[PDB]
């Protein structure tokens, strides 16, 4: 069919990146809101774009959680990567969490400031990378607007979940997580 120069065929392959789960986190998209970060073959995080709150506490006692050390480390590492990667984050009151019970629950308020200097834009930009591979349908922004992105959701919610084949729109891929490893200390304001 697609025979180039009369002697070569154009052929394809697709890689089954799910087999990389044993050594690296994989991101995957369901519907146009849920995103999952899969860890090993047992757990992971669920990233949900929602119009409902989960935390009205407005505190995030990371140091209490650290002293107790009851949380899964792989999952906390992922949360840290996500959080630290948010550029120009200084609106600490926009973030709250409930790291008690040995569980992970993190809430980012995208309506705290609602232009482009808002923490919401910074949070959505990290989201785009962490869930790269369907994050664009969930964002529901046109292309060429990354610099100033806003969405239809009030909160970005991250909570620990269990393993399931949590995929509809995209295929599991390590790229989002891996890409963020170089951005961990970028776009940080003085204290």
């Amino acid at each position, epitope marked *: 069919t697609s025979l180039y120069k009369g002697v070569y065929e154009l052929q394809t392959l697709e890689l089954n990146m799910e087999t990389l789960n044993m050594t690296m986190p994989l991101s995957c998209t369901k519907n146009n809101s849920h995103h999952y970060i899969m860890v090993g073959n047992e757990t992971g995080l669920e990233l949900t774009l929602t119009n409902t709150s989960i935390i009205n*506490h407005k505190f995030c006692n990371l140091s209490d959680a650290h002293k107790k050390n009851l949380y899964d480390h792989a999952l906390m590492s992922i949360i840290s990567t996500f959080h630290l990667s948010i550029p120009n984050f200084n609106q600490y009151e926009a973030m709250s969490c409930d790291f008690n019970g040995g569980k992970i629950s993190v809430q980012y308020n995208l309506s705290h400031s609602y232009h482009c200097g808002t923490v919401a834009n910074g949070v959505l930009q990290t989201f785009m990378r962490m869930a790269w591979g369907g994050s664009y349908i969930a964002l529901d922004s046109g292309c060429g607007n990354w610099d100033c992105i806003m969405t239809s959701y009030q909160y970005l919610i991250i909570q620990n979940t269990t393993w399931e084949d949590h995929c509809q729109f995209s295929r599991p891929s390590p790229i989002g997580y891996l890409g963020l490893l170089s951005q961990r200390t970028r776009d940080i304001y003085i204290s």
Partner: antibody
Framework: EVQLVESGGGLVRPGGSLRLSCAASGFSFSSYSMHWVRHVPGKGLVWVSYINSDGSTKIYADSVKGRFSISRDNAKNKLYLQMDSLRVEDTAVYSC????????????WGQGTLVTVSS | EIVLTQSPSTLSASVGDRVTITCRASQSINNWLAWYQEKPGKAPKLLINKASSLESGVPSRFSGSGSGTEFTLTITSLQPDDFATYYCQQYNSNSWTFGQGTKVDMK
């Protein structure tokens, strides 16, 4: 996902008692206040009671006083409503409602359960 | 201590017709009015909240207004599936008040 699940319904003889409970799951329940609402199919929907997230405020509908006791178990994330001296007019489907003002999806409803008072 | 009144208590309509109902508050409820659609045999469905914010899964033909004491719910073109008793609810007290409801009948 944010969810409220009621249980403990059933048949009560007039003047008897029934304890309802409601399991909260997927959110930081102990930080939120809660309401009980009941539905009588031939009437409109009506409010029953309200409890503050720390339990310091407990209020009831004027039509129901001295019969209901509202409480919360923050450790277990369970909302309770203890009803006594149940009257025939208290027959309704009871359900949990999590109302948050300024939330973009302000009302989280459970499924409810039927409490029937009859002879 | 807030008492809501709906009106007209009954109204009839043709299918596809434009109908409106109202709700009148006593004290102010700001824009914290909610509306419900009650079908026989079913729990009421929340349609609108925050006076005019349409709830998820609710058809675009539904709307509403008000931010003080005068409120409304409207249907741009009534469907066979919209013949229901409609109720208004205020939630500016932590002691919710529901109106008596209005019923849309077919003529």
């Amino acid at each position: 996902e944010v969810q409220l699940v009621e249980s403990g319904g059933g048949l009560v003889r007039p003047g008897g008692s029934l304890r309802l409970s409601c399991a909260a799951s997927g959110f930081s329940f102990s930080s939120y206040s809660m309401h009980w609402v009941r539905h009588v199919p031939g009437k409109g929907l009506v409010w029953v009671s309200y409890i503050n997230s720390d339990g310091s405020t407990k209020i009831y509908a004027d039509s129901v006083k001295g019969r209901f006791s509202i409480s919360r178990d923050n450790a277990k994330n369970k909302l309770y409503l203890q009803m006594d001296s149940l009257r025939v007019e208290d027959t309704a489907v009871y359900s949990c409602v999590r109302l948050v003002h300024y939330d973009w999806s302000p009302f989280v409803w459970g499924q409810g359960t039927l409490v029937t008072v009859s002879s | 201590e807030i008492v809501l009144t709906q009106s007209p208590s009954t109204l009839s309509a043709s299918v596809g017709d434009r109908v409106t109902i109202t709700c009148r508050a006593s004290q102010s409820i700001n824009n914290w009015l909610a509306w419900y659609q009650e079908k026989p045999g079913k729990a009421p469905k929340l349609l609108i909240n925050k006076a005019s914010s349409l709830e998820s899964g609710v058809p675009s033909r539904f709307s509403g207004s008000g931010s003080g004491t005068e409120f409304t719910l409207t249907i741009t073109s009534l469907q066979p599936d919209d013949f229901a008793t409609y109720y208004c609810q205020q939630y500016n007290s932590n002691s919710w008040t529901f109106g008596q409801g209005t019923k849309v009948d077919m003529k």
